[PDB]
Subunit: 104 residues, 4 copies
């Protein structure tokens, strides 16, 4: 069994982790990596951003081929139902628990 | 000024919102949309997923051209420093505040 | 059939609320009220604070100044197991869902 | 120069911790301890609970049964403005950062 801090260090190394308290169900959390993207690609290609954000980027960067915007790493959950919940957050219980385990 | 609930309804409609308490700084939050992705593309194309997740998908879906996995909508923050924080979360203060405003 | 924003407005008015899927486990959330306490009370009376915090207050707030410290309102959950989780937080799913209901 | 996991272990041992960038504003987080309270006390004594919750306990827990209710440990923040934010939550950035420090 691990603390949440050990779970986090495992997540940073690319592993899948879970809490025993979740009682299996095929649930686990994982980390999606950071990347820095060109603003022109943000404006002209990226599907998964709302138009208001893309318009803001376009207004402040124009046609720049060199400007970039950093998208941070973040945690996600593969839920029991199979869906990926982007932006998983840790409850007080999760943060203080010592029942974390490695899934992969 | 708006409650967090009004801010959320604005976010669902694609707007950028902020709290006055943040004191400007060009900060705002926004919603990234939901999508359902083919598992073959998850395995063979998606860059922004860790290899452990991609290997799990490959082992359970193989070469399927029809299986899909849903990635939920989520909130993000465009921070003062210009970075996009994926998976923004609301503090108790944020949830209970009535100083939310529309940015765009 | 209530958004999270409407659930929050109901919580601010003292109700117990839940998402429909929680019914089987009987979970709900509620809001604990704000209060402002005098520094002497914090240092010498309040049991539910760690010694380091009481000590910080004593040394960074003379109780000779007449100062009070505000303890903010916050959300809590009555869990399936019957425990009270202080400091409940909303997942992306919870924030964007429209299946909230009033329990009382 | 501490991960969030090491910060959590220090919090569990009663310390006040912060991220380095918080120094200018003097913010820190701390853990409030768990306790178990008898139901009669919850219904008839505890001020810092809403009436609906006290009423729920009274009607879903006879105080004739000898039952106690556990109130979990949780994190809090001493904010820049000096207020105590009950139920502090960790952002993705906070969870993945390695700039945590012990304040006391
Ligand atoms: N709604 C939704 N769609 C998803 C999600 N994950 C993947 N997709 C879809 O899969 C496409 C390819 O993802 P990719 O290979 O990571 O290719 C991505 C990736 O390389 C990069 N990118 C965009 N946003 C981020 C981000 O927040 N973090 C990282 N690390 N890369 C990102 O930009 C490329 C193009 O992005 P898109 O045009 O959006 O193209 C995305 C998008 O249509 C998700 O969680 N939600
Ligand atoms: N560990 C733990 N114990 C709990 C909890 N809820 C109640 N108690 C216990 O019940 C006692 C009485 O609570 P109270 O009548 O609300 O009486 C409280 C309340 O009036 C006030 N107070 C302290 N902290 C807060 C806070 O964060 N918010 C509010 N609104 N009042 C607070 O100070 C009084 C004395 O506090 P204590 O000496 O701590 O005394 C508390 C504490 O021993 C909980 O969630 N966790």
């Amino acid at each position: 069994s691990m603390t949440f801090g050990q779970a986090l260090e495992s997540l940073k190394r690319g592993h899948l982790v879970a809490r025993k308290g979740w009682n299996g169900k095929g649930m686990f959390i994982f980390m999606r990596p950071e990347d820095s993207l060109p603003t022109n690609m943000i404006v002209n290609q990226v599907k998964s951003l709302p138009e208001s954000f893309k318009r803001w980027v376009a207004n402040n960067h124009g046609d720049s081929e060199t400007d970039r915007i950093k998208f941070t790493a973040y945690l996600c959950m593969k839920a029991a139902d199979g869906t990926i919940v982007n932006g998983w957050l840790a409850s007080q219980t999760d943060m203080l628990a010592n029942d974390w385990v490695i899934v992969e």
